[PDB]
Design an enzyme around this catalytic site. Structure first.
Site, PDB file in Angstrom:
ATOM      1  N   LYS A   1     -29.630  54.592   4.462  1.00  0.00           N
ATOM      2  CA  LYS A   1     -29.529  52.711   3.027  1.00  0.00           C
ATOM      3  C   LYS A   1     -28.695  53.451   1.950  1.00  0.00           C
ATOM      4  O   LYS A   1     -28.225  51.826   1.092  1.00  0.00           O
ATOM      5  CB  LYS A   1     -30.666  52.707   2.845  1.00  0.00           C
ATOM      6  CG  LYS A   1     -31.708  52.054   3.785  1.00  0.00           C
TER       7      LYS A   1
ATOM      8  N   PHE B   1     -30.274  67.296   1.237  1.00  0.00           N
ATOM      9  CA  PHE B   1     -30.927  68.401   0.826  1.00  0.00           C
ATOM     10  C   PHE B   1     -32.531  68.734   1.338  1.00  0.00           C
ATOM     11  O   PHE B   1     -32.715  69.214   2.379  1.00  0.00           O
ATOM     12  CB  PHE B   1     -30.605  69.201  -0.874  1.00  0.00           C
ATOM     13  CG  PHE B   1     -31.461  69.895  -1.263  1.00  0.00           C
ATOM     14  CD1 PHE B   1     -31.650  71.488  -0.525  1.00  0.00           C
ATOM     15  CD2 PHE B   1     -32.465  69.534  -1.914  1.00  0.00           C
ATOM     16  CE1 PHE B   1     -32.376  72.106  -0.491  1.00  0.00           C
ATOM     17  CE2 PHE B   1     -33.163  70.789  -2.732  1.00  0.00           C
ATOM     18  CZ  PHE B   1     -33.505  72.162  -2.281  1.00  0.00           C
TER      19      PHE B   1
ATOM     20  N   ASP C   1     -36.351  69.047   5.806  1.00  0.00           N
ATOM     21  CA  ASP C   1     -37.559  68.967   5.295  1.00  0.00           C
ATOM     22  C   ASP C   1     -37.369  68.803   7.288  1.00  0.00           C
ATOM     23  O   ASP C   1     -38.740  68.596   7.886  1.00  0.00           O
ATOM     24  CB  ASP C   1     -38.125  67.486   4.862  1.00  0.00           C
ATOM     25  CG  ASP C   1     -39.270  66.712   5.581  1.00  0.00           C
ATOM     26  OD1 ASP C   1     -38.902  65.756   6.252  1.00  0.00           O
ATOM     27  OD2 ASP C   1     -40.335  67.227   5.059  1.00  0.00           O
TER      28      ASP C   1
ATOM     29  N   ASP D   1     -40.647  69.674   9.543  1.00  0.00           N
ATOM     30  CA  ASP D   1     -42.071  69.160  11.064  1.00  0.00           C
ATOM     31  C   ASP D   1     -41.054  69.268  12.243  1.00  0.00           C
ATOM     32  O   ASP D   1     -41.525  68.224  12.359  1.00  0.00           O
ATOM     33  CB  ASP D   1     -41.252  67.696   9.677  1.00  0.00           C
ATOM     34  CG  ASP D   1     -41.727  67.313   8.523  1.00  0.00           C
ATOM     35  OD1 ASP D   1     -42.457  67.946   7.946  1.00  0.00           O
ATOM     36  OD2 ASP D   1     -41.751  66.260   7.404  1.00  0.00           O
TER      37      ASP D   1
ATOM     38  N   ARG E   1     -32.809  61.571  13.084  1.00  0.00           N
ATOM     39  CA  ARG E   1     -32.275  61.401  11.654  1.00  0.00           C
ATOM     40  C   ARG E   1     -31.399  60.304  11.279  1.00  0.00           C
ATOM     41  O   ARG E   1     -30.224  60.911  11.833  1.00  0.00           O
ATOM     42  CB  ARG E   1     -32.124  62.163  10.828  1.00  0.00           C
ATOM     43  CG  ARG E   1     -32.203  62.546   9.259  1.00  0.00           C
ATOM     44  CD  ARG E   1     -33.096  61.820   8.233  1.00  0.00           C
ATOM     45  NE  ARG E   1     -34.387  62.826   8.049  1.00  0.00           N
ATOM     46  CZ  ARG E   1     -35.569  62.481   7.279  1.00  0.00           C
ATOM     47  NH1 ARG E   1     -35.546  61.551   7.378  1.00  0.00           N
ATOM     48  NH2 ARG E   1     -36.222  63.247   7.127  1.00  0.00           N
TER      49      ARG E   1
ATOM     50  N   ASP F   1     -48.138  69.274   0.510  1.00  0.00           N
ATOM     51  CA  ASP F   1     -48.003  67.820   1.933  1.00  0.00           C
ATOM     52  C   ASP F   1     -48.783  69.249   2.957  1.00  0.00           C
ATOM     53  O   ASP F   1     -48.684  69.167   4.135  1.00  0.00           O
ATOM     54  CB  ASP F   1     -46.700  67.889   2.716  1.00  0.00           C
ATOM     55  CG  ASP F   1     -45.862  66.942   3.501  1.00  0.00           C
ATOM     56  OD1 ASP F   1     -46.185  65.886   3.484  1.00  0.00           O
ATOM     57  OD2 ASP F   1     -45.879  67.707   4.363  1.00  0.00           O
TER      58      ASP F   1
ATOM     59  N   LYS G   1     -44.187  64.148  -3.862  1.00  0.00           N
ATOM     60  CA  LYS G   1     -43.819  64.741  -2.916  1.00  0.00           C
ATOM     61  C   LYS G   1     -42.165  63.452  -3.095  1.00  0.00           C
ATOM     62  O   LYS G   1     -40.856  63.562  -2.080  1.00  0.00           O
ATOM     63  CB  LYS G   1     -44.126  64.909  -1.493  1.00  0.00           C
ATOM     64  CG  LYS G   1     -44.554  63.974  -0.576  1.00  0.00           C
ATOM     65  CD  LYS G   1     -43.884  64.668   0.484  1.00  0.00           C
ATOM     66  CE  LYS G   1     -45.078  63.209   1.935  1.00  0.00           C
ATOM     67  NZ  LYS G   1     -45.622  63.110   2.833  1.00  0.00           N
TER      68      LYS G   1
ATOM     69  N   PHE H   1     -44.230  53.612  -0.953  1.00  0.00           N
ATOM     70  CA  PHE H   1     -42.764  53.635  -0.647  1.00  0.00           C
ATOM     71  C   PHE H   1     -43.537  54.912   0.387  1.00  0.00           C
ATOM     72  O   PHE H   1     -42.957  53.851   1.897  1.00  0.00           O
ATOM     73  CB  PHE H   1     -41.853  53.926  -1.448  1.00  0.00           C
ATOM     74  CG  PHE H   1     -40.161  54.542  -0.451  1.00  0.00           C
ATOM     75  CD1 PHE H   1     -40.578  55.564  -0.231  1.00  0.00           C
ATOM     76  CD2 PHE H   1     -39.656  53.537   0.088  1.00  0.00           C
ATOM     77  CE1 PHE H   1     -39.423  56.139   0.383  1.00  0.00           C
ATOM     78  CE2 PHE H   1     -38.769  54.328   0.291  1.00  0.00           C
ATOM     79  CZ  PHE H   1     -38.478  54.880   0.618  1.00  0.00           C
TER      80      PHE H   1
ATOM     81  N   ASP I   1     -43.360  54.844   4.174  1.00  0.00           N
ATOM     82  CA  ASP I   1     -42.895  55.617   4.876  1.00  0.00           C
ATOM     83  C   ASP I   1     -43.547  56.407   6.449  1.00  0.00           C
ATOM     84  O   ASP I   1     -43.485  56.379   7.400  1.00  0.00           O
ATOM     85  CB  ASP I   1     -42.750  56.182   4.266  1.00  0.00           C
ATOM     86  CG  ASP I   1     -41.987  57.840   5.130  1.00  0.00           C
ATOM     87  OD1 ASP I   1     -40.781  57.333   6.085  1.00  0.00           O
ATOM     88  OD2 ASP I   1     -41.931  58.851   5.420  1.00  0.00           O
ATOM     89  N   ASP I   2     -45.234  56.346   6.028  1.00  0.00           N
ATOM     90  CA  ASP I   2     -46.413  57.117   6.420  1.00  0.00           C
ATOM     91  C   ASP I   2     -46.379  56.004   8.080  1.00  0.00           C
ATOM     92  O   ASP I   2     -46.670  56.196   9.708  1.00  0.00           O
ATOM     93  CB  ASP I   2     -47.719  57.357   6.440  1.00  0.00           C
ATOM     94  CG  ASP I   2     -47.440  58.628   5.117  1.00  0.00           C
ATOM     95  OD1 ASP I   2     -45.845  59.107   5.240  1.00  0.00           O
ATOM     96  OD2 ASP I   2     -48.381  58.657   4.859  1.00  0.00           O
TER      97      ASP I   2
HETATM   98  C1  LIG Z   1     -36.624  72.279  -0.370  1.00  0.00           C
HETATM   99  C2  LIG Z   1     -37.546  71.997  -0.053  1.00  0.00           C
HETATM  100  C3  LIG Z   1     -38.026  72.438   0.798  1.00  0.00           C
HETATM  101  O1  LIG Z   1     -37.836  70.282  -0.467  1.00  0.00           O
HETATM  102  C4  LIG Z   1     -37.949  69.297   0.174  1.00  0.00           C
HETATM  103  C5  LIG Z   1     -38.169  69.068   1.082  1.00  0.00           C
HETATM  104  C6  LIG Z   1     -38.044  67.216   1.449  1.00  0.00           C
HETATM  105  C7  LIG Z   1     -38.663  67.106   1.115  1.00  0.00           C
HETATM  106  C8  LIG Z   1     -39.328  65.479   1.179  1.00  0.00           C
HETATM  107  C9  LIG Z   1     -40.083  64.596   0.743  1.00  0.00           C
HETATM  108  C10 LIG Z   1     -40.526  63.228   0.379  1.00  0.00           C
HETATM  109  N1  LIG Z   1     -39.685  62.839   1.861  1.00  0.00           N
HETATM  110  C11 LIG Z   1     -39.330  63.275   2.958  1.00  0.00           C
HETATM  111  N2  LIG Z   1     -38.895  63.262   3.634  1.00  0.00           N
HETATM  112  C12 LIG Z   1     -40.320  62.217   4.976  1.00  0.00           C
HETATM  113  P1  LIG Z   1     -39.741  61.522   6.029  1.00  0.00           P
HETATM  114  O2  LIG Z   1     -39.292  62.624   7.282  1.00  0.00           O
HETATM  115  O3  LIG Z   1     -38.356  61.465   6.012  1.00  0.00           O
HETATM  116  O4  LIG Z   1     -40.670  60.660   7.131  1.00  0.00           O
HETATM  117  P2  LIG Z   1     -41.967  62.668   5.376  1.00  0.00           P
HETATM  118  O5  LIG Z   1     -41.830  64.280   5.610  1.00  0.00           O
HETATM  119  O6  LIG Z   1     -42.471  63.395   4.106  1.00  0.00           O
HETATM  120  O7  LIG Z   1     -42.850  61.758   5.251  1.00  0.00           O
HETATM  121  C13 LIG Z   1     -38.818  65.220   2.941  1.00  0.00           C
HETATM  122  C14 LIG Z   1     -39.487  67.144   0.052  1.00  0.00           C
HETATM  123  C15 LIG Z   1     -38.948  68.310  -0.727  1.00  0.00           C
HETATM  124 MG   LIG Z   2     -40.524  64.468   7.487  1.00  0.00          MG
HETATM  125 MG   LIG Z   3     -42.289  66.476   5.966  1.00  0.00          MG
HETATM  126 MG   LIG Z   4     -42.225  60.207   7.224  1.00  0.00          MG
END
Ligand SMILES: CC(C)Oc1ccc(-c2ccnc(NC(P(=O)(O)O)P(=O)(O)O)c2)cc1
Ligand SMILES: [Mg+2]
Ligand SMILES: [Mg+2]
Ligand SMILES: [Mg+2]
Ligand SMILES: CC(C)Oc1ccc(-c2ccnc(NC(P(=O)(O)O)P(=O)(O)O)c2)cc1
Ligand SMILES: [Mg+2]
Ligand SMILES: [Mg+2]
Ligand SMILES: [Mg+2]
Lengths: 346, 346
Positions: A50, A91, A96, A100, A105, A167, A193, A232, A236-237
């Protein structure tokens, strides 16, 4: 409206970003193949979202800098800094999605799941991070806010990685972590986060670019913006499970990944002893049947209705915070961002 | 001798490093569990190496700053900056061991192979990187070389990640890449992936700390140091296969990982058509039998003897470079480092 207005220019600037970051292939041929890979990484992972975080930079900048001071070079720097926030996002998401075990994506297979990429994506992700600091040097090095922007991006990444650590620690694979899934814990996770980098960072970068460097002004912006970031993340959750995946462009993994999601915290506060057991036996596991049972429990507990009520109370709270803390910044800076995140289904 | 002399103090300072990076648990309790994980990550991954890159900072600093200017606070900053180089190393190795499918490092199982860690180590690695910039802020922010150190660490990481990209691209899994394994390619890889951060960075950081910021002085140091870094990588490639693993503390994976190693480049320059085929059929594959056949080919071609000859010619070349480019810096700065890397079996 203000985002719709600025979007096309922002996205169009991506080409120059790409051009400037690949311009080192000129003087050093020997890194040609790496620079080519960098371009493919940028094109795959920095496009297709977005662009809200990057656009917030440009929007806020236009609203905060006196229009007489918005010359061509000044605007180019603002768009570049907005792109830096988008590169930071790219990044984070690349890494992530690995962490996960995600599948898709932004409407496509996750970069690390592409055949021939795999865990090489760790290095790709870190190169995206390195690009931020190359672009700050190339475009802003001579500006009085240069150091401020550097420290802001480095500090935001640290805080975000602290959040990511909470997390992961709260979500171990193979172990039941119900006891840890509390409101208090949830708020701490999401503040670190998500809220710093997704809300405080882009507004603060534009503040610094406008010469607004005061501690009190930053702390007042932060009070509004971290609360917006918490909302936000809760959205997202909620969208991880109940969102439409042709809108969201990503498949949810929170239940399988044992995450401290807002949904599971809400479920816990409301579960009977027997529903607690259903949650205990089914949460944090890969079996599609067990994920289905968790979702059926959430739906049994009217969680979508609880989210829709939360979305309304939170919106009011955030708007009260804007009435309190926006001055002396234009309230439009914060309202345009609230409009863009609320009642949103992507 | 000079390294042996400074080592104990350097290693002892690790405690203060740990203390200062965990001191945020005081004012923000809610991040306690992340800070605890950060401490375990630092203890597991930042300790147990030779500390040569970090020690080079302290050694060079003592040799470059007038002894009258080496007060307690000044020395603490030097040790902190040496630790920053070690944290950068720990960041890189944690991620690289994932990428290379390694088993052991520094005499123990690789962090990502520990049960309960796995790909969470991606985030751990990045936190190690974030710690560098926290420590530069906490200890050096008021110094005239502050920005110089920031840009030096960011630039070094970018260059190293560019090198890592060339390394991965030249080594695809599942594909024969013999054609790409050339001398020219090899030198480019190692210059970026190893030589910048392992040799130029620590000496340049101490230069900046001593107020030696001239472009010509940096370029003259760099001519010596990048050539030393190339030798260091060729020795690392030789040790991957022929080193003693109770000395090296790590099991080699270059042949299995299809790497453009100095060994395979040397082998190619020397192979008959039939030995080329042996290499073709056996290189870049997980089978222990095929890895054994490659090693037997290298030994058949006297590669250890070719390395020992290269070690001698390279040493002479580097010493010629020190005669040419050391001034006006003390040649001891470079010689102490050469002594520490040559005829070395760890
Ligand atoms: C160096 C790297 C490992 O650090 C990070 C990488 C990603 C993130 C981060 C922060 C906030 N949201 C996301 N993605 C979301 P998303 O996967 O898009 O739904 P989340 O997994 O928390 O539900 C990733 C935070 C830190
Ligand atoms: Mg994720
Ligand atoms: Mg995550
Ligand atoms: Mg998420
Ligand atoms: C962000 C991260 C992925 O970037 C990097 C991580 C690690 C490295 C790197 C550079 C030089 N040497 C190493 N490790 C050695 P080693 O595994 O210790 O023998 P190599 O795999 O090249 O043989 C790693 C370079 C970049
Ligand atoms: Mg490697
Ligand atoms: Mg390796
Ligand atoms: Mg190696």
């Amino acid at each position: 409206d203000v985002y719709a207005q600025e979007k096309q220019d922002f996205v169009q600037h991506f080409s120059q970003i790409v051009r400037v970051l690949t311009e080192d292939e000129m003087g050093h041929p020997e890194i040609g193949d790496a620079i080519a890979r960098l371009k493919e990484v940028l094109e795959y992972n920095a496009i297709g979202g977005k662009y809200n975080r990057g656009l917030t930079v440009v929007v806020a900048f236009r609203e905060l800098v006196e229009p007489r001071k918005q010359d061509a070079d000044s605007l180019q720097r603002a768009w570049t800094v907005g792109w830096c926030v988008e590169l930071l996002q790219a990044f984070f998401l690349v890494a992530d999605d690995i962490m996960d075990s995600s599948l898709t994506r932004r409407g496509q297979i996750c970069w690390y799941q592409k055949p021939g990429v795999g865990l090489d994506a760790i290095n790709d992700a870190n190169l995206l991070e390195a690009c931020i600091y190359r672009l700050l040097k190339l475009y802003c090095r001579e500006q009085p806010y240069y150091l401020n922007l550097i420290e802001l991006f480095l500090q935001s990444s640290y805080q975000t990685e602290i959040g990511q650590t909470l997390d992961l620690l709260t979500a171990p694979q193979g172990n039941v972590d119900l006891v840890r899934f509390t409101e208090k814990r949830y708020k701490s996770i999401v503040k670190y986060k998500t809220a710093f980098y997704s809300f405080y960072l882009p507004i603060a970068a534009a503040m610094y670019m406008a010469g607004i460097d005061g501690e009190k002004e930053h702390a007042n912006a932060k009070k509004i913006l971290l609360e917006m970031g918490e909302f936000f993340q809760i959205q997202d959750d909620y969208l991880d499970l109940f969102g439409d995946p042709s809108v969201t462009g990503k498949i949810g993994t929170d239940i399988q990944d044992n995450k401290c999601s807002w949904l599971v915290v809400q479920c816990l506060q409301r579960a009977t002893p027997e529903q607690y057991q259903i949650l205990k036996e089914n949460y944090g596991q890969k079996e599609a049947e067990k994920v289905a049972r968790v979702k059926a429990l959430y739906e049994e507990l009217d969680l979508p209705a609880v989210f829709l009520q939360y979305e309304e109370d939170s919106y009011s709270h955030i708007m009260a915070l804007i009435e309190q803390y926006a001055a002396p910044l234009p309230p439009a800076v914060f309202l345009g961002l609230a409009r863009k995140i609320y009642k949103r289904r992507k």
